Amino acid sequence: PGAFGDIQASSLDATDIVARTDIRLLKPSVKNIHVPYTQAVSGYEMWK
Amino acid sequence: PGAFGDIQASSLDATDIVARTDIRLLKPSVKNIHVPYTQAVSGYEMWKNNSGRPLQETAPFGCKIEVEPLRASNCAYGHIPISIDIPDAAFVRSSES
Amino acid sequence: PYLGFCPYCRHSAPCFSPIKIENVWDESDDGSIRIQVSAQFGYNQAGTADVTKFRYMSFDHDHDIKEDSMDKIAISTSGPCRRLGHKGYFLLAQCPPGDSVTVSITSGASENSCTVEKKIRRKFVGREEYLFPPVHGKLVKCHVYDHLKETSAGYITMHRPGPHAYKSYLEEASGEVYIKPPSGKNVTYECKCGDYSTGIVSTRTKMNGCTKAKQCIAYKSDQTKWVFNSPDLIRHTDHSVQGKLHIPFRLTPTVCPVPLAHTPTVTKWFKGITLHLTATRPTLLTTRKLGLRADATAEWITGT
Amino acid sequence: PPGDSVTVSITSGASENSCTVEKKIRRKFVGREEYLFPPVHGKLVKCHVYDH
Amino acid sequence: RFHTVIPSPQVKCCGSLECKASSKADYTCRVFGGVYPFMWGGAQCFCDSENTQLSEAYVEFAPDCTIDHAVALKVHTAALKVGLRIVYGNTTAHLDTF
């Protein structure tokens, strides 16, 4: 996570996309329906 | 002037406020009515900008600072000599144990 | 509803305007700012309560009280501001970052605006920078201005108005000076062309012994008003405390939402740790030892 | 106000024609102290301005 | 934060003034000579000279200091109090002691 190749696939349209971006869900707190989460920044952008 | 505690009082509602802010009045130059004055910046803001981290994040021995009243809870340091008069009722003689 | 001497009018140079900004406060943590101006809002000519309209002093020699509507008020620092509340001398508005604050009345083509320098910065509450209160996060203690207009943050003292002389009341003709009070209004006049002489007149009145208009003055006995203790007015002889307005929009405490940063990744090693940290905005990290020496370290961290 | 370019536009009804040209318009002052606006009180110094 | 409050200036229109001795916070009063001030009508006095003005200023507490203020204190010897849980045999006990 946070490094180049943090998402990989054999092709743009390939369905065997493999990801490890260090995404973790968090318990909701507000009354309204919504799902919170946190995730590492795009390593592709960091390499760019 | 220009530092912490440039204005002081015994309380917020106290009327005996004493301060030294280096306020000075200048001659009015322009035709229209006004009273010019130059004054040093508020030292309270100067301290606020340069306050630094509070004691909650710098106290040693892992002591948790708290207020109202000022105190330091869960402060681990040293040894406490304790002398205790444990009652003899709880004791059980060896002849039965 | 007096008029101040605004440093920056619509065109540029300082001039007298009814909407001079006297004081600006931005102590609230939500970015809302309380502003004080000379004009009276929420009231009509008689002072009766009404949210639809405000009053001010006219630009004429009678300087009676004129009126206008809320829709013609504009508040702006760098972009247009949102008016949150209005009461008496005071406004409360949420504004974007800017170096100065401007309040203007758009009476058709008459865009009378007063601007005053005030470094209004974007401030936050907590240990994490953000642009907006996040939907999900911790609830911490904050202090924000109350939007209720009937609250009280303190008080401001007002006093009776002082003399405000006019030259329109005076007339020069054949090297002689005359006083022309407005119809139906008694006017106190005073002059010095030799002996000092006071008096009160109510009609077109001659004066003798005077050759130049500058040497006399006249003003109506306007005891039917109150004026804030502003530095742009000439005070009455008896400048005793004669009133106290409340300061609305008290700074009340409440609960504000603040974001929670991404959980660090801790890698252990012999007598030490390595925290891999990711924070898109500046996040505060504070570490300290629990021994004799704190060795406290604080740092604002950005990126990864 | 300060800006990186200057634009002049005409709005004939719904027909809007605007020409923009790059020009680094900066805030400049006269004297030895920066200020957003000329203050009410202060010294009177020599300056040069386009005649209105 | 201090609110620098400036009372409305007065002018002895064709006479003289003297600075009084008030007891406000950081009270500052000065007297200036002939000014000949303008309000809105082109004139306020009739004497071009001997038209003194009184400039007055002092400071008070800002309206928002009831929340935004700092309190200064001096500390002395501190007494350490302990809440303690002790168990002997079957009996447990909670006690607060100095």
3 state SS for C49-105: EEEEEEEEECCCCCCCEEEEEHHHEEEECCCECEEEEEEEEEEEEECCCEEEEEEEE
Cβ atoms of C34 and C43 within 8 Å: the answer is no
Residues in chain D: 52
Question: How far apart, in whole angstroms, are the C-alpha atoms of residue D35 and residue D40?
Answer: 12
C219 Cβ contact list (under 8 Å, min separation 6):
C163, C164, C165, C166, C169, C187, C188
- Cβ proximity of C56 and C62 under 8 Å: no
Report the neighbours of E using a cutoff of 3 or more CB pairs below 8 angstroms: B, C
Task: List chain B residues with CB under 8 Å of D40.
Answer: 30, 32, 34, 36
Closest residue by Cα to residue C28 from C160, C132, C151, C120: C120
* Distance between CA atoms of residues B36 and B22, nearest Å: 14
- Strands (DSSP E) found in chain D: 3-12, 15-25
Nearest Cα to Cα of residue C83 among C11, C35, C37 = C35
C-alpha closest to that of C135 among A30, D25, E77: A30
What method did the depositors use to determine the structure?
A: cryo-EM
> B45: helix, coil or strand?
helix
Supply φ then ψ for residue C253, to 5 degrees: -80, 155
Residue D39 burial (10 A CB sphere; 0-12, 13-18, 19+)? middle
**DSSP assignment of E33-65:** -----BSSBS-S-S-SSS--EEEEEEEEE-GGG
Residue C213: phi, psi to the nearest 5?
-65, -30
Give the containing element (helix H, strand E) for B48. helix B43-49
- Measure the N-to-C terminal CA separation of chain A; round to a whole number of Å: 15
Question: In this complex, how many residue pairs, one in chain A and one in chain C, have their CB atoms less than 8 Å apart?
Answer: 28
Q: How many residues does chain A have?
A: 48
Tell me whether residues A38 and C303 touch, CB distance under 8 A.
Answer: no
With b for 16 or more beta-carbon neighbours within 10 A and e for fewer, the E47-66 pattern comes to beeebbbbbbbbbbbbbbbe
Q: How far apart are CA B47 and CA B55, in angstroms?
A: 15
DSSP-derived pairing of the beta strands C196-201 and C4-6: unpaired
Q: Select from B28, C234, D41, B40 the least CA-distant residue to E31.
A: B28
Q: Using the beta-carbon criterion (under 8 Å), do E56 and B35 form an inter-chain contact?
A: yes
CA distances from B27 to A1, C120, C166 (A): 67, 30, 25
Interchain CB distance below 8 Å, E4 and B21: yes
Q: Is C294 left (phi over 0), alpha (psi -120 to 50) or beta?
A: alpha
- What is the rounded distance in angstroms from the CA atom of residue A29 to the CA atom of residue B36? 54
Dihedral sign of CA atoms C77, B21, B13, E10 in order? negative
The three-class DSSP label of residue C32 is strand
Of C136, C265, C280, the CB nearest to A30: C136
Pairing of strands B7-8, A37-39: unpaired
Name the resolution in angstroms. Answer: 4.7
Phi-psi region of D42 (alpha: psi -120 to 50; beta: other; left: phi over 0): left
**The pair of three-digit structure tokens given for residue E26, joined into one six-digit string:** 């950081």
What would the CATH number be for the domain defined by C4-161+246-255?
A: 2.60.40.3200
B53 in C contact zone (CB under 8 Å): yes
**Residues facing residue E57 across a β-bridge:** E28
3-state DSSP call for residue C24? strand
Token pair of C129, please?
């920078």
DSSP C176-243: EEEE-PPTT--EEEEEESSSEEEEEE-S-EEESS---GGGEEEEE---S--EE--TTSPBPSS-----
Count Cβ atoms within 10 A of the Cβ of residue C232 and give its class: 0-12 exposed, 13-18 middle, 19 or more buried. Answer: buried
Please say whether the beta carbons of C95 and C103 come within 8 A: no
Token code pair at residue C123: 């401030």
Give CA–CA dist C120/C100, Å, rounded. Answer: 7
